[PDB]
């Protein structure tokens, strides 16, 4: 069905010549290369690199069109299919690549970055669904959970949503000390902003983390006990005593990082 | 009336979404049965929607038991919670009827299926195995099955190095 994708380009390419930005011969060069790319994607042996090179191609085509618009048309945006057509396609190619290669973590990031960069074109809701899909293919990679938690605490400043991320992320990945460290880091940021707002409120006129500290310590030990024991319990008493030693030291080191973390927050006691 | 399919792997738990519903009246027709063997046809029926690998060897055995006595683990609860919409009632296809009541208790809004239609798809999922995971990291099932095998067995017999 390579043609079916190809025919979608014709109304766009017709718009280019009609506006006069691109000559007949020039567009033929564009369509030819597009034709070459589509066959590669639709064929066996296609790789994620194949989607990347195609995606890079349109971006340069997009730059040529807009840059040409100022030189020839002398208009910021010509009201026609051409202006938003390329941007629709690039997202479409990406979606195919993500579906075609969900495993490649790298290729997703381009979509989140690409989708995020053109915020005006692309509503945050579209960004949400991609994260919903991406978390949900890879629940065990903590680095998503912080990433989407990150995005909606800075771009949107919706702490209620960001907190739910850590709650869900911790539900899947309770043994990752980093995400706990990341979750307490967010909470203390929320408290510091809140009290600073309170200070500003006066001028113009936290315990929660410690609970995270405590509950974190219990589960990490529980999982660290699970590992180093394998399928079965340890019959030897002395070895069982040892397994208590590593967790204490592992938990002690895991505590010590927070002791460093608290040091940053001057506002807090 | 099925939309989501629950499957379990030695590496983890896999959920599938049923894009197309096979004919139920003609379930026994050779032509529908040949499709289950055919990977190309099968991919049109379902699509892998989630996979959450087990954290380590210990977790797999614990879940391997919990599946055996028809119980829901914390890992299973988390996955189903994230995937199944609240919704009249979303339908989930499951191999075990005994896991049915357990799933219903934790999630009142899900209705489980274990009819031959569900079994037919579950067979297809297990037929193609890692090919349906579309490149996702599921290790090697055959070795992981070997990994859990005596591990599940020796546990019940209470085998020990002593």
């Amino acid at each position: 069905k390579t043609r079916y994708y190809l025919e979608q380009c014709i109304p766009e390419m017709d718009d280019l010549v009609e506006k006069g930005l691109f000559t007949k011969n020039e567009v033929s060069l564009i369509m030819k290369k597009r034709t070459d790319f589509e066959h590669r994607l639709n064929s066996r042996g296609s790789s994620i690199n194949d989607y990347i090179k195609y995606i890079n191609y349109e971006s340069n085509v997009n730059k040529l069109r807009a840059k040409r618009c100022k030189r020839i048309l002398q208009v910021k945006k010509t009201n026609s299919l051409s202006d938003w057509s390329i941007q629709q396609r690039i997202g479409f190619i990406y979606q195919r690549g993500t579906n075609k290669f969900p495993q490649d973590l790298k290729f997703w990031a381009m979509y989140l970055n690409y989708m995020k960069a053109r915020g005006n074109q692309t509503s945050y809701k579209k960004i949400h669904n991609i994260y919903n899909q991406l978390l949900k293919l890879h629940p065990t990679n903590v680095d998503i959970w912080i990433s989407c938690a990150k995005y909606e605490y800075e771009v949107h400043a919706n702490f209620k949503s960001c907190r739910n991320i850590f709650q869900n992320g911790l539900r899947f990945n309770p043994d990752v000390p980093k995400l706990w460290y990341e979750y307490v880091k967010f909470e203390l940021n929320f408290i510091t902003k809140l009290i600073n707002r309170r200070k500003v409120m006066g001028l113009i006129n936290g315990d929660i983390a410690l609970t995270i500290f405590d509950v974190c310590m219990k589960t990490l030990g529980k999982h660290y006990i699970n590992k180093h024991k394998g399928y079965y319990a340890i019959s030897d008493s002395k070895m069982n005593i040892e397994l208590n030693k590593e967790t204490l030291n592992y938990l002690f080191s895991e505590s010590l990082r927070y002791i460093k973390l608290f040091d940053e927050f001057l506002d807090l006691e | 009336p099925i939309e989501y399919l629950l499957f379990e792997e030695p590496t983890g738990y896999a959920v599938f979404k049923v894009k197309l519903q096979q004919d139920d009246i003609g379930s026994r027709l050779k032509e529908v049965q040949e499709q289950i063997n055919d990977f190309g046809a099968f991919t049109k029926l379902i699509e892998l929607v989630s996979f959450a690998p087990f954290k380590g060897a210990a977790e797999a055995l614990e879940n391997a038991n919990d599946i055996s006595e028809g119980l829901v683990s914390e890992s299973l609860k988390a996955i189903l919670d994230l995937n199944l919409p609240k919704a009249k009632n979303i339908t989930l296809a499951i191999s075990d009827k005994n896991l049915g009541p357990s799933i219903k208790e934790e999630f009142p809004y899900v209705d489980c299926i274990s009819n031959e239609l569900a079994q037919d798809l579950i067979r297809g999922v297990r037929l193609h195995g890692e090919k349906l995971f579309k490149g996702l990291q599921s290790g090697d099932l055959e070795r992981a099955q070997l990994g859990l095998g005596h591990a599940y067995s020796r546990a019940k017999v209470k085998f020990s190095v002593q």
Binding site: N132, N164, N168, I208, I212 | -
Partner: peptide
């Protein structure tokens, strides 16, 4: 559709969710 961004349980499934919400009711 089920979304991680909005909590879908309507009750706190994880014991963490029990502890945090207790403070939030306590705080304000």
């Amino acid at each position: 559709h089920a979304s991680a961004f909005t909590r879908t349980q309507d009750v706190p499934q994880t014991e963490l969710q029990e502890k945090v919400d207790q403070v939030l009711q306590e705080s304000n």
